[PDB]
């Protein structure tokens, strides 16, 4: 039983579910009632849960560690019988983000400053854990250069997987080709390692009275504009949150280009966990990268 | 623009939004106090949003007449501008379902004996309308035979879309092998059509003082037993609901070998939704029964 599991990892004599069934695609969540405060609680069944979300922990204490953005406080990951695993949160009252957006966008700009201006400074590409984008692990091996962590860990892996699992003809040779265009989007830039969300997609912000809420990380050290491919991907940010955050770090010359790239991953990504919906996304981004 | 036209088709003066809800997976569900009373509101913005409220109208009609269930009233389905429906219905005061999960367990084995002990003469499997689970349209045509029902128009539906969304050949072949080893897995039972609700899991149900509710059907006339996967597998059940609906309906022998195939639809259609992390419990069921 969830409930008496959660009350005996917990500690607590009360626990009472509290609204709707947490809107999750990757995980199920529920909220629960408890004597030292409300709390979250996302339940995924698959044998590698624990990974997965001991990453997801990992991005929360990295965010969190910054004192610049708004995260739920992680309290505890536990092995579920039958396998899988439980992950249980700070509760957090939330709202869809909207009047919270300006402020938004200042702080994932001094979050994404925050580690070229610090005392301690990470010269590398990467992340010291695994982190998932989605349910798909991802390799964060440190790397010195920015286009060829992103070439290698991410572009690549995600490839490689489109690869065993559709083996698809058409992103094999355009890859072919796109491959040896990637340093051209890159050059003549200074790209610094920036601590990142990983995915700040509408659907993983929100809001409360005291401001912007950031959640569901998948975080490691990249290039800042990364971030924003999945914050005008799939919509909902208000332009607000764009307009504050490029007042900060304004659109470096070949942003539009680089986009382009970063929009590629996303939908690689979504290739592989979704299917072929978004293989003409896919392949489609790409020639327009060749043309 | 959504406020302003849900006040012109419920014609109120008055449209104040309470709970903040923003609660369900599939459709947005926002709560308003309206001159004629609090009303509940869906929104869908997919093409094919009018057709899946109306299956769930059709659903909510046909359990509301057997005055077995508390279910929402539905009220109005409306198309709107930029594409998508809204659904209006009855509010409910709702709270998570725990001390009435034992009248649940009457109250569903009731419905379920309606049909084969009431004014209900439904001698096939099916319904007369196409009724939707989640965003996925299912075919009701009626069927004499219940293991023909279910294998084309349920798991054979699902297969085919996984067969063009993911090509997986894994899935074909042991879809192949069950095909062969489903008439053995109902032991000669003549199988008598149920009306069902057809998404009984826990986030479909609550209780209010009165007792036990359920909404968002997808309703059909099935084995009875198929109503019970989805609730077993996803938890959030008392031990007491399944307790008091088997006081009324016995597990028929196999019981366990056919929850499996139950549950095996639910995993099928949990990857069409969320993606491929539902593949490795959907192989593992095919394979735990072909063994
Ligand atoms: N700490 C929290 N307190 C309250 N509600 C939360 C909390 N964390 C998440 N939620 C709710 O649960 C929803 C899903 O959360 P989350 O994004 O972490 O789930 P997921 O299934 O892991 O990911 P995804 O939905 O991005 O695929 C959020 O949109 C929000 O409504
Ligand atoms: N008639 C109602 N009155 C009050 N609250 C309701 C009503 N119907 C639904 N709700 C609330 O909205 C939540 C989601 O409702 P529902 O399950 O119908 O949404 P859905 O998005 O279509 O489906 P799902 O969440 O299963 O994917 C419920 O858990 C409940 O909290």
Redesign the pocket.
Known sequence: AMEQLLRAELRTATLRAF?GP????????R?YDTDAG???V?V?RRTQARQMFEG?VASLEALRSTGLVRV?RPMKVIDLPGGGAAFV??????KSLSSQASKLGEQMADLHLYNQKGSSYVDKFGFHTVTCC?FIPQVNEWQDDWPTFFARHRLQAQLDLIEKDYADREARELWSRLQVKIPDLFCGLEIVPALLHG?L?S??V?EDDVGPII??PASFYGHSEFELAIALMFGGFPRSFFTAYHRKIPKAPGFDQRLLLYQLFNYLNHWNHFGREYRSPSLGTMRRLLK
């Open positions: 609204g947490g809107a999750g695609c990757i995980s199920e969540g909220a409300p709390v979250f996302k995924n997801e739920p949160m700070e509760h957090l009252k939330m989605g995915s997609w659907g993983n929100a959640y569901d």
